């Protein structure tokens, strides 16, 4: 179906990208109109010669423009277009998630857009700037510390820890152990309990790093005496115990 | 052909010629679909057999159009555009016959397409009689049938290799070559003989 529709668009498409960027100032309907146009174009994926035409009609200008400018649907349609049509360095070059993670406590249209951008952040899951993105993700997660969408946010953070080096992982794990003193909330506790596996994968490669490791071991020993789901967090805290054994091998 | 008594003449026969051309193009496209996979299944078998019944009907119409040797219909269809579609049908025929022969399941559709070939050449013989000596109709016959002449190799080798097959297979080192004389003869034995 989309084949024949795109061929009809190659019969009649009807500087549109420049005119996209103007009518924000005053009219909303033409903006949502081009958003629906590019979203419909995003719903298709031999036919590789028209997969070129998917890639053909410059688009990254509009992507980066709507990556930081209402705000839910246009950017969501652009992400749907970009992920289907169009490595990790250019993937993180778009920092679009920076103002979204920055405005993570802005409560209301964006307060409805927050659960949209939770699952929208699941879409790019497939060196300093990596530390910056880990900081923004930890800021949004502590803002999240919607709940069923927060499960998708937690899966997004799990794949974010699965994305990798270990230096920015330790830089974010410092804040994770800092927030673990505030909880060990329970979602941040389970997030740090899952991040204990990535810290174990970093410390097995590695064997104030050992100083923060001993501080985390003492805080985990205190959380073991501070007391199902808490039992699950304690059983995944044994991954942090193995990390400490491989080491010894809102503000 | 014309309705002499009636006002706005319509040749109904050129219309069904063009319909047959559309039929032929769609048969050709069905062949280009099944030209690669070559294990044709009951959906395509059934629908394509229905199309064989379509063309089986319409070539019989074309016979009884010109079976009475009325020369206006002769000159009409001789001047028509079906002649390239005839070449397309032959290109369907020859390239179908190989993979139809290579299947024991497709023997029914082979029989149907073979019957369609028979109706085609019956219609061709029926219209091919009205020649005084040469005829401009005969000119056009001969010229577009030599324009046809690439696929005819396959059907002629097809005919001869099904025909002098049985002209050979009653000989000395064929029939008692297997002792039953029935056709329990093995593959390499028959091959060698």
């Amino acid at each position: 179906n989309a084949n024949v529709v795109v061929r009809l668009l190659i019969r009649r498409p009807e500087g549109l990208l420049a005119a996209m960027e103007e009518a924000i100032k005053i009219g909303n309907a033409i903006m949502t109109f081009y958003a629906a146009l590019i979203d419909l174009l995003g719903r298709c994926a031999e036919a590789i010669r028209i997969r070129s035409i998917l890639r053909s009609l410059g688009d990254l200008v509009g992507v980066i423009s709507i990556a930081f400018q209402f705000c839910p649907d246009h950017k969501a349609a652009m992400v749907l277009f970009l992920d289907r049509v169009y490595v990790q360095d250019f993937l993180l070059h778009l920092l679009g998630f920076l103002p979204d993670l920055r405005a993570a406590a802005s409560l209301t249209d964006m307060a409805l857009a927050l659960n949209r951008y939770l699952c929208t952040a699941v879409l790019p899951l497939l060196l300093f700037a990596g530390t910056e993105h880990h900081a923004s993700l930890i800021d949004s997660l502590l803002h999240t510390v919607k709940g069923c969408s927060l499960t998708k946010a937690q899966r997004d953070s799990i794949e974010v820890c699965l994305l990798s080096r270990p230096s920015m992982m330790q830089h974010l794990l410092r804040r994770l152990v800092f927030d673990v003193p505030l909880l060990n909330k329970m979602p941040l506790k389970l997030l740090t309990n899952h991040y204990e596996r990535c810290w174990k994968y970093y410390c097995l490669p590695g064997g104030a790093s050992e100083e923060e490791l001993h501080l985390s071991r003492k805080l985990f020993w205190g959380i073991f005496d501070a007391l199902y789901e808490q039992e699950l967090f304690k059983l995944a805290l044994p991954c942090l115990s193995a990390v400490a054994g491989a080491l010894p091998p809102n503000f | 052909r014309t309705q002499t008594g009636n006002n706005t003449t319509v040749n109904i026969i050129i219309s069904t010629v063009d319909y047959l051309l559309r039929v032929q193009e769609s048969i050709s496209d069905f062949y280009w679909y099944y030209s690669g996979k070559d294990v044709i299944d009951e959906q395509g078998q059934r629908n394509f057999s229905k199309a064989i019944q379509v063309a089986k009907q319409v070539f019989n119409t074309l016979t009884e159009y010109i079976q009475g040797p009325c020369t206006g219909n002769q000159q009409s269809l001789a001047h028509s555009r079906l002649w390239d579609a005839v070449v397309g049908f032959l290109h369907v025929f020859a390239h179908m016959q190989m993979k139809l022969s290579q299947d024991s399941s497709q023997i029914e559709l082979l029989k149907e397409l073979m019957d369609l070939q028979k109706d085609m050449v019956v219609m061709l013989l029926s219209m091919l009689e009205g020649n005084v000596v040469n005829g401009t109709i005969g000119k056009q016959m001969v010229d577009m049938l030599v324009e046809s002449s690439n696929n005819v190799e396959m059907i002629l080798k097809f005919f001869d290799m099904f025909l002098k097959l049985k002209d050979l297979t009653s000989s000395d080192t064929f029939k008692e070559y297997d002792p039953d004389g029935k056709g329990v003869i093995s593959k390499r034995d028959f091959h060698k003989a």
């Binding site: 500087g15 010669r49 | 062949y31 390239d84």
Partner: protein, 371 residues
């Protein structure tokens, strides 16, 4: 009457310049240019258009299934519509491809039009459709049917933009003028467009480099056949059946090869070599005389031809002045009027257009350095 394998044709619009039908045809240089462009034929009389950078050859053409089979593989074949075709540039041997760049406006992503080496890929394949309800798709392609050019790679209408040519979603009809088809036809036969010598019995010549600036006309004996300056391209005043068999009486333009200029009898002075602008009918073109519209019968040959030459406007005849045997035109002249001919070759012509291409491009480069 129709189109088959190996047919010399051209493509052309009568483009509108405020409804003035600018009869401009497809032009592609090659051997130094990978782009295609335009060539106006509306002034076919005074500033005449070129031929070899405009003609194309119907190489090969098939249906959808055929194309698929070809892509899977890692005679005459009379044209039917809806078929992707293979176009060779008849001069350069290149093949028409939609260039995937944006060397125009663009005017978003319509693509560029050019030539390439291979026949591979889908850019060398061009579907043809009648934009007329009177004729069908898949039926026979007649003489002069305005049609649709759509690729298989870009799958876009080969559009006459502005003077640009692009592949876009914007239709453009195209005229087809059969030139020499088919075949071409047997050897030893004069068919227009050919480049050849002038056998005096000894030849004709043009002065050598840095001299005039190469505008005089002389006879010469010796190995000036080996020189390229004894080469003369045939050029028809007409367009359709330009590659007909050449008959007497009918006049044709003649054009010097190495300079590119036109063999021009300036009636004021002598037989000269004038430019494209002066290249009128009775200034440069000669009626071809045996005495002192389709393929055409093979009237004139190469081995045996008594080529008397009468000018259109003046009526003068092929003679000389008193080796610097300066060839002129006169009412009778000598008994050296009906000379003989000898053809050139294919690689010779391919060098020959590169010769004056080199001349133009490097003189422009020299003066760009000079500025």
């Amino acid at each position: 009457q129709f189109l088959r394998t190996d047919d010399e044709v051209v493509l052309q619009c009568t483009a509108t310049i405020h409804k003035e039908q600018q009869k401009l045809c497809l032009a592609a240089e090659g051997f130094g240019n990978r782009l295609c462009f335009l060539e106006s034929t509306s002034n076919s009389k005074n500033v005449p258009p070129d031929l070899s950078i405009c003609t194309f050859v119907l190489e090969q053409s098939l249906s959808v299934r055929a194309l698929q089979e070809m892509l899977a593989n890692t005679g005459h074949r009379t044209l039917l519509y809806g078929h992707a075709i293979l176009l060779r540039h008849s001069y350069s041997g290149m093949y028409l491809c939609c260039l995937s760049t944006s060397r125009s406006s663009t005017d978003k992503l319509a693509f560029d039009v050019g030539l390439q080496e291979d026949t591979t890929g889908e850019a060398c394949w061009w579907t043809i459709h009648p934009a007329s309800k009177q004729r069908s798709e898949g039926e026979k392609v007649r003489v002069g049917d305005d049609l649709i050019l759509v690729s298989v790679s870009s799958e876009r209408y080969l559009h006459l933009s502005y003077l640009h040519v692009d592949a876009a979603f914007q239709q453009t009809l195209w005229s087809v003028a059969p030139i020499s088809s088919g075949s071409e036809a047997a050897q030893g036969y004069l068919i227009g467009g050919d480049v050849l010598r002038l056998l005096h019995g000894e030849c004709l010549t043009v002065p050598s480099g840095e001299h005039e600036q190469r505008r005089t006309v002389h006879y010469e004996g010796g190995a000036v056949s080996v020189h390229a300056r004894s080469l003369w391209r045939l050029e028809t005043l007409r367009v359709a059946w330009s590659g007909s068999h050449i008959r007497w009486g009918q006049p044709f333009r003649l054009r010097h090869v190495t300079t590119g200029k036109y063999l021009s009898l300036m009636e004021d002075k002598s037989l000269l070599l004038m430019d494209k602008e002066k290249a009128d009918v009775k200034s440069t073109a000669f009626t071809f005389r045996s005495s002192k519209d389709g393929m055409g019968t093979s009237e004139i040959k190469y081995g045996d031809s008594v080529c008397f030459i009468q000018h259109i406007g003046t009526g003068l005849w092929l003679t000389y002045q008193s080796i610097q045997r300066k060839a002129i035109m006169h009412h009778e002249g000598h008994m050296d009027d009906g000379l003989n001919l000898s053809r050139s070759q294919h690689e010779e012509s391919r060098t020959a257009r590169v010769i004056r291409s080199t001349v133009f491009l490097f003189n422009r480069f020299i003066r760009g350095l000079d500025a």
